[PDB]
Symmetry: C2
C-alpha cells in the first residue's frame, strides 16, 4: 500500500510536469494550472477511486461522502515566478491519512528536481537522501523571508525582527525555499499567509530531512481536508535545527 | 568580431566547468578565483595584447595599456551560489576603447547563455530573443533588489516605482536582466552595482531591443584602465523605451 502511494504520487507529478513544460516560457498560467490539476487527479483516482482530492484550482472532490485519504494539490506554487519565466515555482502534492500528511512532493519540472518526503523514511532529492544542516545560533543563520501574502502590518514587524537577528537574510521563493532548507543550504524559512495546499506537502519533506516546521506560535501545522474544510491562511516557520527554530519563535513574538 | 565571440564562449565554458564542480558542495571564494583564472587563461592565450579586469585583482595586462579590456565577474550572485540557488551568473564584457562590444550572461547550472554582440540581435543558447512591448508602467512586471549600499534615498525611490507597477517582484542579480532580455519582465531597477556587474548587461539588453541607463537616464559608462576606480552605480533597464521614461519619472533622481 505505501509503495503504491509513492508510485502513484510520482506518476501524478510526472503528469503535471509534462503539462507545465508545454506552457512555461510561452492566460497560459491559468490553463497550465487547470490542465495540470486535471492530469494529476486522473492519475490519482484511476489508482485510488476511494480517495478524495483537494486542489488549488477546484477545491474538494470525492465521488463518496467521505474519504480516509485526501490528496491536496497545488500544480503551480509560485505563479508569479512561472509567469515571469523563473523556474523556481513548484508542483506540490500531499497525501493525508485522517488529516495527517504521510507523503509530500516538491517537484520542479523544468529543473528536474523532485523532493519526496514519506513517513518513516528519510527525504530524498532525485532519489538521493538529503539532510538539514546543524546551526546553533540564530546569529549564524541563512534565512528566507517573503513579503506578507495578506499584507499584514503585524507580520511585517515580525519579519523585521527576525531578519535583524540572522547572518544572511534573503528573499524567498515559494516552495523552493523549503526544498533548499531540506537539502541543508539554508537554516530558516518564514512566510505569512499561506493556504494549506502550499504547505502540507512541505511537512513530510522537511521533517523527514531532520527539520522542523510549525506555525508562528510553535504549534503543529494542521489542516484536515474534508468536504466542509475551509482553506484559510496560515503563517509558517521552518528550520533545519530545533535550536534555531525556538530562537526564531522568540523573535516572532507571536 | 566572430573571433572575440568564439573566445568569449570558450571563456564562459571554462568558468562553467569550475562552477559546476563547486556548486552545492570557502567553496565560493575558491570557485570564484578558480573560475576567474580559467577565464583569464583562455582570454590571454588568444589575446595577449588585451587587458582583464576583475574585483579581486583590478586591472591586469602584460602591457601598460590596452585597447581591449575584458571585465569579468565569475559569480554575480554569491549569496545565491552559497545557498544553492542556480540564479547567479557569470558575466563577461569586452570593451573596445571603453565601450562594451560583447556581453555574456551565463548560468552554468541551468545551461543558459545570453550573448549580446554589437551589430547582432541577442541570443539565448543560439536563438534570437527580444524584449516585449508594454503599454504603461501600471501594467509592468518589475524586479527590484534592496539597495546594495543601504541608501535611504534609494529605498524611497524603490517604493515609488514599486507602487506604480502591476507586479513588483524581488530581483536575482544578473538573471533578472536575462529574463528582461527574453521578454518575460518589463523593468529591472537596482542600486549600488559595480561595473563588473553591469557592463556585460548592456550589449545583451540593447541587442534584445531594450534600454539600460543610470537613474537619471544617462548612459552607463565605465572605462576600465590602469587608474580607473570601480565605483558604484544605480541601474534601470526596461524592455520598452516608454516604460523606461515613466520609470525615470517615478525615481525622481
Ligand atoms: Cl481505492
Ligand atoms: Cl500576511
Ligand atoms: Cl501562526
Ligand atoms: Cl593580441
Ligand atoms: Cl544603494
Ligand atoms: Cl544614477
Amino acid at each position: 500500500q505505501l509503495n503504491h502511494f509513492s508510485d502513484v504520487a510520482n506518476k501524478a507529478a510526472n503528469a503535471a510536469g509534462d503539462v507545465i513544460r508545454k506552457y512555461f516560457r510561452k492566460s497560459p498560467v491559468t490553463i497550465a494550472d487547470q490542465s495540470a490539476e486535471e492530469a494529476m487527479v486522473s492519475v490519482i483516482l484511476d489508482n485510488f477511486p476511494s480517495h478524495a482530492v483537494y486542489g488549488e484550482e477546484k477545491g474538494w472532490r470525492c465521488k463518496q461522502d467521505s474519504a480516509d485519504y485526501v490528496w491536496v494539490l497545488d500544480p503551480i506554487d509560485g505563479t508569479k515566478s512561472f509567469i515571469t519565466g523563473k523556474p523556481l515555482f513548484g508542483t506540490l502534492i500531499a497525501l493525508l491519512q485522517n488529516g495527517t500528511p504521510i507523503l509530500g512532493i516538491i517537484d520542479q519540472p523544468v529543473l528536474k528536481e523532485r523532493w519526496i518526503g514519506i513517513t518513516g523514511k528519510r527525504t530524498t532529492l532525485n532519489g538521493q537522501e538529503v539532510s538539514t544542516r546543524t546551526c546553533a545560533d540564530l546569529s549564524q543563520a541563512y534565512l528566507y523571508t517573503t513579503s506578507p501574502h495578506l499584507f499584514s502590518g503585524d507580520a511585517e514587524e515580525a519579519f523585521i525582527r527576525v531578519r535583524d537577528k540572522v547572518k544572511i537574510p534573503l528573499y524567498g521563493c515559494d516552495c523552493y525555499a523549503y526544498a533548499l532548507l531540506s537539502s541543508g543550504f539554508v537554516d530558516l524559512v518564514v512566510e505569512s499567509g499561506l493556504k494549506p495546499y502550499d504547505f502540507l506537502a512541505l511537512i513530510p519533506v522537511i521533517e523527514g530531512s531532520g527539520g522542523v516546521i510549525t506555525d508562528w506560535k510553535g504549534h503543529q501545522l494542521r489542516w484536515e481536508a474534508s468536504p466542509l474544510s475551509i482553506a484559510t491562511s496560515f503563517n509558517v516557520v521552518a528550520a533545519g535545527d530545533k535550536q534555531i527554530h525556538q530562537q526564531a519563535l522568540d523573535s516572532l513574538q507571536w
